[PDB]
């Protein structure tokens, strides 16, 4: 009755830093990479026979090798290359999930011009991709999720919250003016891999930020829906977008005990607890792709 | 074509500390609680009408209130109570997911006896539960996952890794003796809620640790399978167990450049990258319950 | 023979968020504040008599009250105000140390123009101050340190390390080209409080970054000295600057086992260990001020 | 006028894991090591000449080499060995500061008996040492600090706070019963190196915990003084002890809005801000040793 179920394995958090230096004007790619293979690894679990298993150490080596041989431009393309490579190398594998985070760098400003080889981290969120490749030859299927994590944004007005359901345990007062502060985590799924990854990423990021700032918010739920639907409207190549946003409470401090007023000016930025508002915006007219999301954000 | 998809919302990371003090011998319950409601919250997203929405601030209040009114013994029972409470209070909700972490405390030792009201954190992993309650009356269904996170364990021998698939990118040497060090994250699903939560948790924890230590390991895959299957064999009330284990590499340092040998004695404990080995052990004869795992470990 | 020695107490990590909203173009001040008082607090330790002790809860309240009553422009001036305020209110105090971190925000870009009230974290290090105020009236003395923390910068060339002391345990090869990557932590001391804080901070920041990028580095030691001395040369109002810089190693990966060369292109970004290079650049012609540095970065 | 001031350099956070395996009952030493050398390193900063400089990479190698050649028993003795070793190898050095953290492991319990080679982290704070060695031959001086960090302890009663200085900004009510929760950070200085390090460490740890639990607390100040003075009374070989303790507030939640009372039972465990109470207990009859504390806890 007892059997092995779902399983996957690979190398997590391979930090690879790639320099392009064909000219004195260097460029950098600063990545954190996860590999996970799926397939027939039953004996490796049940009996200990490792014949099917490519070591995770080799998967790490492959990241560094392909960083040179294939290069690193868009992380989506690097992830697709890695997935197909592992399927070529590991016959027992049925699929590969490659996840990548990119940390952006700007050139250090020297007298108004960016320096040739000196850089400063941009520090405004992490660009992400989750690429799943399954099968080989005519049976190969691939899925790309892209996203942004740790994008810390806030609005100091243009946020309300009223008309909610009131309970015998509700103390929160309705309001027409509050701070709305979050750290956005989001992933969206592409319908195909015929995408200009950098162009679309930059556009999606701008839409998310513009909608957050300019949409008068009646709830974080409604802000997220407006952000996500704007992305889908502008990008028909995107099938769905998931958004997970903490409501990082900035509490208006009561200054009456100190003889002072506080007309929306002085706040306590509380760490925990925080509202956590999570929503998916989807194209109803296209098929779902659960394969793309399997074990995202994690296995268990 | 564009619509709201899956969504959930609630209060994350409510830190509640409950003291039992009916006698001078105090007891403590130190919890971190997440609430998330699912249901008909479409208008709250699409139009901004919050009529269906119970504020996350109220969900936090409810945690503190029920900590007194219902008490906190086993976290599974507290989570079940919270889920049913929210379904009573929020008619638009179809379901509730309550996740809880517990941090264990020991009594401070005073001359051989634990002190009445002075405590020290135990610091050997976090006990967890994820409880999902859906529906009401005769249609109510509930699911309980329990687990352990951040259980840091290692063996200094009794670990091999050889006979693996070798690639043109493989540099790793086969070995019959290595350190196997991990931080275990695991969750298991109960078949019913007629369970002695504390008794079963303690037994499962002991089985996991005993099997890790005493099973001669030919791979982390095989160690995890032996751990998980032992749990299922001893606990027929458990339907499945998922295990996610990093292989935290302790590298045998080359001391030959310094005129020294190193017969398995001096190691460099590397942070990243790390192998990440993930496996599920399941009862083949019982139905799956995907409802229990939805949005575990997270939404996206 | 046993007595109370040095001691200090206060409220740590008061997160205050101040909004300036007299016009629709809001401005933000996002601060983390520490207070610590020194003085005659002996009985509070030895006998338990708290008569001299202002609660740390009150110190927290004071941060919020004065954020409204006095406002928050330059954090140096807010810290000076807080220290003088505590000396007025706590007769037993002989001194106050006020430390502040500021997290910078940019306006969200909306079609080329920054939004009136929507912001995104800048994410390029933390501006800091440590202000010590001692005494009252004609006997009052004050000292201001300002600084930058977590400024993550890297050069991909223009860094060498050769000609070093050799030793039987040395395996490192000399090199004329490497990456130099760090996270800069620095504090400098002002000779007086008659300083345009914002103008000098911005200038010091630019000098540090410009020197890091443009100085050909023969060692992190020499890079830090060139950075610090350039600051002192440009700013006669600064008495000394201390710099603490990890050398976050980016290791050139050996790709020969994979049939590839690696002409300074593919690197492994290692977490730990890291070189830690720490240096002070000082004006030899002005007196030291150890009072300014007492319990920086911490008490023990 | 501009010169190099104080400076030090070395390798930070060398994670060394030492196994003692001369018999089947293995023992573990799990260390994090910092090295910092001081001396005549001026030209290395000012001119870039590295002739005096031993690479930090070599300092890392030395940790691993001496972990085998000398072994690792008490971390105080390993730190002393390392400091003397660097002074022998680096003629320009005048001193060495070696800091070590140790993470304790227990044996996994297998049916009542600890396993020969399977371990679980103890998780109850970090044992630390800071060893400074200056000079050579008859001029050599050494100082040892030892300590405990991240020892998380709490009392649920036996703590009061009343009779404090009142002030116009005070909202805190006096109380005769509260929780006192902290994470203890402490270091003490030994008068000589003729110390049974393990025996004294275990005794000091027990005294700190016993005094915290059994001393009726009128203030964290008074609790820390009672802890420190008890250590000095029991250990004439200890010259001084510094303690830094956050007051991690557990707030009694107001349950009156929910129709419930709360007789000291339900608390909100707040993250930030926190009181920070720091005190030194010293032997008035012995000389100070500022050399032992230089750049503890850090350089700037």
Summarize the annotated binding site of B for O2 as residue ranges: 56, 247
Distance CA(A67)–CA(C178), nearest Å, equals: 18
Tokens representing C162 are 């050769």
Distance CA(C12)–CA(D11), nearest Å, equals: 30
Tokens representing A186 are 């989001």
The closest CB to that of D272, out of A171, A258, A271, belongs to: A271
Q: Which chains touch C (3 or more CB pairs under 8 A)?
A: A, B, D
Residues A131/A72, Cβ–Cβ less than 8 Å: no
Q: Which chains touch A (3 or more CB pairs under 8 A)?
A: B, C, D
Summarize the annotated binding site of D for O2 as residue ranges: 56, 247
Residues D49/D19, Cβ–Cβ less than 8 Å: no
Instruction: Look up residue C161 and give its DSSP letter.
Output: B
Between chains, do C21 and A250 touch, taking CB under 8 Å as contact? Answer: no
Between chains, do B50 and A219 touch, taking CB under 8 Å as contact? Answer: yes
* C243-266 core/surface letters (b: 16 or more CB in 10 A; e: else): bbbbbbbbebbebeebebebeebb
Q: Say if A256 is an interface residue toward chain D (CB within 8 Å).
A: no
Residues D133/D83, Cβ–Cβ less than 8 Å: yes
DSSP string, D242-283: EEEEEE--EEE---GGGT---SS-EEEE--SSEEEEEEEEEE
Residues C133/C80, Cβ–Cβ less than 8 Å: yes
Q: Which residue of D22, D78, D108 is the best one to mutate when testing the B interface, meaning the one whose CB has the most B CBs within 10 A?
A: D108
Q: Say if B234 is an interface residue toward chain A (CB within 8 Å).
A: no
Sign, CA torsion D222/D228/D229/D230: positive
Closest CA to C104 of C174, C194, C198, C206: C198
Distance CA(A58)–CA(D31), nearest Å, equals: 28
For this PDB entry, the determination method is X-ray
Nearest-Cα distance to chain B for C271, in Å, is 7
Q: Say if C25 is an interface residue toward chain A (CB within 8 Å).
A: no
Distance CA(A123)–CA(C122), nearest Å, equals: 7
Distance CA(A172)–CA(C245), nearest Å, equals: 47
Between chains, do B121 and D117 touch, taking CB under 8 Å as contact? Answer: no
Q: Say if D47 is an interface residue toward chain C (CB within 8 Å).
A: yes
Q: Which residue of C16, C156, C182, C260 is the best one to mutate when testing the A interface, meaning the one whose CB has the most A CBs within 10 A?
A: C156
Distance CA(D70)–CA(D87), nearest Å, equals: 16
Distance CA(A18)–CA(A20), nearest Å, equals: 7
Active site residue D128: no
- How many degrees, rounded to 5, is the angle at CA C205 between CA C202 and CA C210? 125
Nearest-Cα distance to chain C for B9, in Å, is 23
Distance CA(C202)–CA(C226), nearest Å, equals: 18
Between chains, do C282 and D9 touch, taking CB under 8 Å as contact? Answer: no
Q: Say if B16 is an interface residue toward chain D (CB within 8 Å).
A: yes
Sign, CA torsion D255/D256/D258/D261: positive
Q: Say if A44 is an interface residue toward chain B (CB within 8 Å).
A: yes
Distance CA(B32)–CA(D193), nearest Å, equals: 45
Distance CA(B246)–CA(B255), nearest Å, equals: 27
- Find residue C267's DSSP bridge partners: A17, C252
For residue B290, count other CB atoms closer than 10 A to its CB. 8
Instruction: Look up residue D291 and give its DSSP letter.
Output: G
Nearest-Cα distance to chain B for D145, in Å, is 24
DSSP H/E element including C45:
helix C42-46
Residues B33/B63, Cβ–Cβ less than 8 Å: yes
Instruction: Look up residue C86 and give its DSSP letter.
Output: H
End-to-end CA distance of chain A: 22
Q: Which residue of B250, B258, B266, B267 is the best one to mutate when testing the C interface, meaning the one whose CB has the most C CBs within 10 A?
A: B258
Resolution, rounded to a tenth of an Å?
Answer: 1.6
Distance CA(D222)–CA(D244), nearest Å, equals: 13
Residues A97/A144, Cβ–Cβ less than 8 Å: no
Active-site residue identified among A42, A56, A94, A126: A56
Between chains, do C169 and B258 touch, taking CB under 8 Å as contact? Answer: yes
DSSP string, A10-76: EEE-EEEEEEE-SSSS-EEEEEEEEEEEEES-HHHHHT---TTPPPHHHHHHHHHHHHHHT--SSHH
Query: Long-range CB contacts (< 8 A, 24+ apart) of B194-201?
Result: B194/B237, B195/B76, B195/B144, B195/B237, B197/B74, B197/B75, B197/B76, B197/B77, B197/B146, B198/B74, B200/B146, B200/B235, B200/B237, B200/B238, B201/B127, B201/B146
List, by residue number, the catalytic residues of C. 11, 56, 249
Distance CA(D184)–CA(D156), nearest Å, equals: 16
% helix / strand / coil in chain A, to the nearest 5?
A: 25, 40, 35
Widest distance between CA atoms in chain C: 76
Burial of B262 (0-12, 13-18, 19+ CB in 10 A): middle
Summarize the annotated binding site of C for 5-hydroxyisourate as residue ranges: 56, 161, 178, 221, 247
Residues C72/C197, Cβ–Cβ less than 8 Å: no
Q: Which residues of D touch B261 (CB under 8 A)?
A: 68
Phi and psi of C298, rounded to 5°? -160, 180
The closest CB to that of C65, out of A206, A258, A263, belongs to: A258
Q: Which residues of A touch B161 (CB under 8 A)?
A: 50, 55
Residues A110/C210, Cβ–Cβ less than 8 Å: yes
Distance CA(D183)–CA(D125), nearest Å, equals: 9
DSSP H/E element including B129:
strand B126-134
Between chains, do A16 and C110 touch, taking CB under 8 Å as contact? Answer: no
End-to-end CA distance of chain B: 22
Q: Say if C257 is an interface residue toward chain B (CB within 8 Å).
A: yes
Tokens representing A10 are 């690979």
Residue in chain B lying closest to D109 (CA): B210
- Find residue D155's DSSP bridge partners: B118, D180
Kindly compute the dihedral angle of the four CA atoms of residues D223, D228, D230, D236, in this order, to the nearest 10 degrees.
-170
Active site residue A11: yes
Burial of A60 (0-12, 13-18, 19+ CB in 10 A): buried
Peptide bond before C297: cis, by omega within 30 degrees of 0? yes
Q: How do B274-283 and D238-247 pair as beta strands?
A: unpaired
Q: Say if B257 is an interface residue toward chain C (CB within 8 Å).
A: yes
For residue C178, count other CB atoms closer than 10 A to its CB. 21
Nearest-Cα distance to chain A for D169, in Å, is 6
- What are the residues whose beta carbons fall under 8 Å from the beta carbon of B297, sequence distance 6 or more? A297, A298, A299, A300
Q: Say if A5 is an interface residue toward chain B (CB within 8 Å).
A: yes
Helix (H, G, I), strand (E, B) or coil at D187: strand
Q: Which chains touch B (3 or more CB pairs under 8 A)?
A: A, C, D
- What are the residues whose beta carbons fall under 8 Å from the beta carbon of A36, sequence distance 6 or more? A8, A9, A10, A96, A97, A98, A99, A295, B276, B278
Nearest-Cα distance to chain A for D268, in Å, is 10
Q: Say if C225 is an interface residue toward chain D (CB within 8 Å).
A: yes
Distance CA(A97)–CA(A85), nearest Å, equals: 12
Residues B274/B247, Cβ–Cβ less than 8 Å: yes
Distance CA(C225)–CA(C205), nearest Å, equals: 15
Q: How do A180-190 and A141-155 pair as beta strands?
A: antiparallel
Between chains, do B168 and C258 touch, taking CB under 8 Å as contact? Answer: yes
Interface of B with A in 173-202 (CB under 8 A): 185-187
Q: Give Cα C22 to chain centroid, integer Å.
A: 31
Q: Say if A165 is an interface residue toward chain D (CB within 8 Å).
A: no
Helix (H, G, I), strand (E, B) or coil at C40: coil
Residues C138/C127, Cβ–Cβ less than 8 Å: no
Distance CA(A242)–CA(A248), nearest Å, equals: 19
Q: Which residues of C touch A263 (CB under 8 A)?
A: 21
End-to-end CA distance of chain C: 22
Q: How do A266-269 and D238-247 pair as beta strands?
A: unpaired
Between chains, do C119 and A262 touch, taking CB under 8 Å as contact? Answer: no
DSSP H/E element including D144:
strand D141-155
Interface of D with C in 75-114 (CB under 8 A): 89-90, 92
Burial of C115 (0-12, 13-18, 19+ CB in 10 A): buried
The closest CB to that of B3, out of A3, A276, A282, belongs to: A282
């Amino acid at each position: 009755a007892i059997v092995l179920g779902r399983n996957q394995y690979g190398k997590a958090e391979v930090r690879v830093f790639r320099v392009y230096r064909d000219t004195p004007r260097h460029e950098v790619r600063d990545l954190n990479v996860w590999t996970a293979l799926r397939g027939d690894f039953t004996d490796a679990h049940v009996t200990g026979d490792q014949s099917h298993v490519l070591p995770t150490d080799t998967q790490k080596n492959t990241v560094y090798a392909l960083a040179k041989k294939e290069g690193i431009r868009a992380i989506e393309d690097f992830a697709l290359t890695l997935g197909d490579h592992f399927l070529r190398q590991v016959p027992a594998a049925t699929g590969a999930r490659i996840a990548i985070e990119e940390y952006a760098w700007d050139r250090i400003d020297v007298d108004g011009t960016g320096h040739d080889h000196g850089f400063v981290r941009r520090g405004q969120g992490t660009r992400t991709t989750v690429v799943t490749v399954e099968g080989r030859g005519d049976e190969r299927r691939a899925w790309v999720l892209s996203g942004i994590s740790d994008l810390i944004i806030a609005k100091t007005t243009g946020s309300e919250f009223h008309g909610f359901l009131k309970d015998e345990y509700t103390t929160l007062e309705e309001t027409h003016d509050r701070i709305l502060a979050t750290s956005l985590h989001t992933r969206w799924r592409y319908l195909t891999t015929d995408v200009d990854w950098d162009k679309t990423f930059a556009s999606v990021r701008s839409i998310l930020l513009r909608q957050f700032a300019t949409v008068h918010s009646l709830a974080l739920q409604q802000t997220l829906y407006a952000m996500g639907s704007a992305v889908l409207e502008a990008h028909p190549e995107i099938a769905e977008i998931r958004l997970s946003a903490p409501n990082k409470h900035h509490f208006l401090v009561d200054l009456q005990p100190f003889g002072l007023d506080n007309p929306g000016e002085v706040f306590y930025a509380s760490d925990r607890p925080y509202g956590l508002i999570e929503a998916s915006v989807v194209r109803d007219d296209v098929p779902e792709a659960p394969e793309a999301w399997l074990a995202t954000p994690g296995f268990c």
